[PDB]
Ligand binder design. Structure first.
Ligand SMILES: Cc1cc2c(cc1C)N(C[C@H](O)[C@H](O)[C@H](O)COP(=O)(O)OP(=O)(O)OC[C@H]1O[C@@H](n3cnc4c(N)ncnc43)[C@H](O)[C@@H]1O)c1[nH]c(=O)[nH]c(=O)c1N2
Length: 460
DNA sequence: ATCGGCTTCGCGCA
DNA sequence: TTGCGCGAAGCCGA
């Protein structure tokens, strides 16, 4: 009934006479969720209800109010969404490995389902969970069109080798979603406290302007499943046609803007591809866009899955390692610390501008992110430091941060992963180089700089 | 084979 | 700002 290559058995065994509970984690949405549909499926063939369980963890302390509210404001809207289909959602606070354990016990779950994520800490949690349960345990890729473990059984060296695999698998996986049928059988803190608690927890780290005013502008992106869908519709109707020709222009904003929604799972990219595919646009712009949400977004999962040190210098390709190592003792033009990068006090004002876009909006322009990471590698004392600075700023300040897409982007920029070797230079070696004067022939750099000049002088 | 083609490069010049 | 060919560069896969 559903394509069963989207399921992997974690733990086998006997079905409890209790509810089917979805350990929701990555795909925080009620529609177009292959994982919650699997849950409803084996629930219905069991005459049991489905419930959903979410577990909140101290990981929010590692980022910002901006993300925590994006996720929490979302989950309030999910709660109404599930409840109106008779699906209870329960919200746990703590370590999954040992609270999902207690839950499975306290409620005698018939079976357990979770979505798929390649992040290391999730594979730790699944382990702590299996060790402590005896009921079955399933994982479902609800996040990729083509399940990650089916797309490829190895690390793909680049897109041109991955892309033929994905598209061969595409006609059998690109399909429509079925309706989420409500519970036939009507079947731990409240959500409002966790929001306010967390906020009081994070306020003293809040980026403030020099006049105590918060730096973040929460209005560029309304959180939520509802909201996500208006973003994609308006993008397919207004911006898709221009995506190819205007995407590399930080002065326009012809991006789809879906990445904070995708990251928190508030929208499936399968619904997106689906709607794009029937859309009558420029074939140029579709291909470019399909390629970003399909090849690049998914090889970003393949990356982390097959490379446990996805955030490490060790996961760069051999040639990139030799090159950067050969240039470790090169004199650097400038050397900034994390904090000088952080507050945009470099000599480059294009760079500082993108540091200001990231600080205030929560979302740096896809093209600028690539310049940003490279001038970090140029102006830091070592690669490993460069890498560690760009991760830290990516996850602290991007709304889409803490994401497979993030590590594999940084790897690309600093370490050449999924890229190729270019003319050898000082410091950066054979890693692909970008310049301010290459930026000038592509967009009106002065316009970008002008937009974010009013922040730097009043940052501290 | 073994060779072309490779996300998002820079640069000069029309 | 446009595009177009060339440049330096390591390596996958048909
Ligand atoms: C230095 C640096 C740092 C990061 C990233 C790249 C670079 C160069 N990326 C990837 C990319 O920059 C990001 O996905 C886009 O900016 C998404 O913004 P839009 O949704 O507007 O993209 P746009 O509308 O152009 O593309 C649509 C979608 O395609 C996918 N996509 C586009 N560019 C991609 C890329 N380079 N890699 C993978 N998937 C891509 C994403 O799902 C994106 O939502 C990333 N992404 C992310 O979600 N979180 C992050 O924290 C980072 N970090």
């Amino acid at each position: 009934i559903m394509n069963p290559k989207r399921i992997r058995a974690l733990k086998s065994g006997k079905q409890g006479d209790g509810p089917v509970v979805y350990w929701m984690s990555r795909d925080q949405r009620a529609e177009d969720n292959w994982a919650l549909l699997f849950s409803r499926a084996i629930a219905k063939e069991a005459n049991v209800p489905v419930v959903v369980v979410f577990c909140l963890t101290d990981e929010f302390l590692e980022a910002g109010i901006r993300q925590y509210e994006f996720m929490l404001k979302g989950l309030q809207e999910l709660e109404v969404s599930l409840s109106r289909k008779k699906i209870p959602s329960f919200f746990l606070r703590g370590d999954p490995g040992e609270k999902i354990s207690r839950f499975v016990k306290d409620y005698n779950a018939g079976t357990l389902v979770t979505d798929f994520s390649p992040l290391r800490i999730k594979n730790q949690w699944i382990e702590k969970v299996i060790s402590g349960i005896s009921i079955p345990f399933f994982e479902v890729d609800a996040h990729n069109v083509v399940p990650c473990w089916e797309a490829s059984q190895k690390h793909e060296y680049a897109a041109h080798t991955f892309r033929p695999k994905l598209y061969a698998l595409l006609p059998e996986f690109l399909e429509e979603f079925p309706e989420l049928e409500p519970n036939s059988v009507t079947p731990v803190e409240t959500l409002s406290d966790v929001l306010e608690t967390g906020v009081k927890a994070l306020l003293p780290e809040r980026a403030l302007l020099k006049n105590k005013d918060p730096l973040f502008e929460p209005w560029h992106f309304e959180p939520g499943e509802k909201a996500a869908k208006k973003v994609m519709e308006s993008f397919i109707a207004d911006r898709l046609d221009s995506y190819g020709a205007l995407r590399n222009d930080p002065t326009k904003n012809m991006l789809s803007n879906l990445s904070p929604y995708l990251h928190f799972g508030q929208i499936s990219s399968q619904r997106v591809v689906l709607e794009v595919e029937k859309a009558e646009s420029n074939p140029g712009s579709k291909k470019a866009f399909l390629d970003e949400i399909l090849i690049w977004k998914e090889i970003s999962d393949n990356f982390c899955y097959y490379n446990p040190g996805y955030d490490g210098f060790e996961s760069f390709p051999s040639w990139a390692k030799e090159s950067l190592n050969a240039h470790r003792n090169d004199v650097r033009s400038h050397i900034y610390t994390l904090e000088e990068f952080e507050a945009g006090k470099t000599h480059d004002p294009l760079w500082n501008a993108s540091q200001m876009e990231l600080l205030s909006t929560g979302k740096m322009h896809g093209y600028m992110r690539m310049y940003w990471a490279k001038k970090i590698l140029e102006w830091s004392e070592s690669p490993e430091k460069a890498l560690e600075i760009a991760i830290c700023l990516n996850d602290r300040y991007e709304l889409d941060g803490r994401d497979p897409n993030g590590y594999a982007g940084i790897a690309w920029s600093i370490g050449g992963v999924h890229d190729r070797a270019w003319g050898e230079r000082e410091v950066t070696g054979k890693i692909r180089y970008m310049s301010y004067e290459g930026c000038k022939r592509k967009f009106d750099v002065k316009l970008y700089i002008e937009k974010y000049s009013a922040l730097d002088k009043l940052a501290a």
